[PDB]
């Protein structure tokens, strides 16, 4: 199976440097080309460079000169990518891809994506809070003011996914985030049946099951 | 840098009728334009690397054609997976410059929103906030007009929405608004409400509380 | 380098026949004399 796993990645202020890996294994990654590619919270992608397979031609982007330096390990078959001198119109989520032609078919990969946001707004948790019911009812659960993004809300850890929609995050002019998760439950089943919003969030490492029931 | 400039951005079609973008460029790059496909949470996906050449295991649906500084992408007939975003991209001139996008949706029958305001928690309260969530579910179009009245007093300035992506049975949208205050200026006053506007709906339609 | 059949995509980095470009209305400069 061919794998682009990316790890290293998270957190950073204005300024502060980080170095990125991506493991490759399951093609020869030591004779294709590979590249990186940043795509800033919804919004389109930018390229960023290329690097030969003995590294004996490495192509960066004018605007990102000087920030990115590139590198790759054809020992443990895995790319690099050395940040410096970061700042917030730098955050987005970074892929490693490799396109070559050999077989004679066009072939591309894409790692996971791993991302990196940069900012000084210190780490915070989400707070939680329940949004009540009421021939359809409906509840909810808030998840207002964390940062960083993401956040990830379930439902009784999986036991209710019909009918639920959970809006995208939004910055509030605190530069804090707060999304909102609700599901649609018969009105009946109420005082029969429990209802529990079960969050988490990897950065802060919270884990918040809310109850939901009316008064 | 080279611009590359895709419209539409948003292309509403159904399933089985056929899609043509298009990615002009600043300057001409020759037959040098390459085509992804990116879902929501999934890296992109290649489709066309010399402007008419398919990657593999692409389908022959995907079509692309263009040379110098006019492209296009067309997609004879659209299935279920087909529907997500389109960049285009460069080739002939380093830094590589990608496209702006261009998102398909599904194009389905009408359908009247779900109208739904939840009050703002008690414990919200401790904290020194207030936020009144006012819900939209299973609608179609993507195109609503929600607002608020504390006391026939029509907002402006202080409310947040944001909307889902289609569903994958459905393909139907869900809104859902956030009227923030404070503490004192929300207990200052008595009637909110939410003003639902929608074309499936025959006349706005309200759901107000007391507090 | 590539054949006199072939040209060099920047972006796959490597050799593309002709062949593929001869069903096109536009080829390579290089593709005609193979086309
Ligand atoms: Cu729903
Ligand atoms: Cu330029």
Redesign the interface.
Known sequence: EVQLVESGGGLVQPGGSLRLSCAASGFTFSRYWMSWVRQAPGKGLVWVGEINPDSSTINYAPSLKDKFTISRDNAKNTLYLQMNSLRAEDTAVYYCASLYYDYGDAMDYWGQGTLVTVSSASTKGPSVFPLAPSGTAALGCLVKDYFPEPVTVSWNSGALTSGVHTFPAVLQSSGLYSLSSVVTVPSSSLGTQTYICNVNHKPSNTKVDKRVEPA | ?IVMTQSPATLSVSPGERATLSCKASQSVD??V?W?Q?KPGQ????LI????????GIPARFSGSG?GTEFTLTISSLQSEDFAVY?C?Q??N????????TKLELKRTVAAP?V?I????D??LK?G?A?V?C?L?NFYPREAKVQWKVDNALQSGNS?E???EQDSKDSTY?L?S?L?LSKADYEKHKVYACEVTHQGLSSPVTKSFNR | QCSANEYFDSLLHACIPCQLRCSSATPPATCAAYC
Do not use: I
Not at chain 2, 49 to 56: D, E, G, I, K
């Open positions: 840098e037959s040098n390459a992804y990116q890296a992109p996906r290649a690397y010399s402007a008419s050449l398919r990657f593999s040379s960049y991209q080739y002939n380093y830094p590589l410059t990608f496209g702006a996008g779900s739904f939840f009050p703002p928690s414990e919200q904290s906030t936020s969530v819900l579910n947040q944001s909307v889902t869900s859902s956030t923030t």
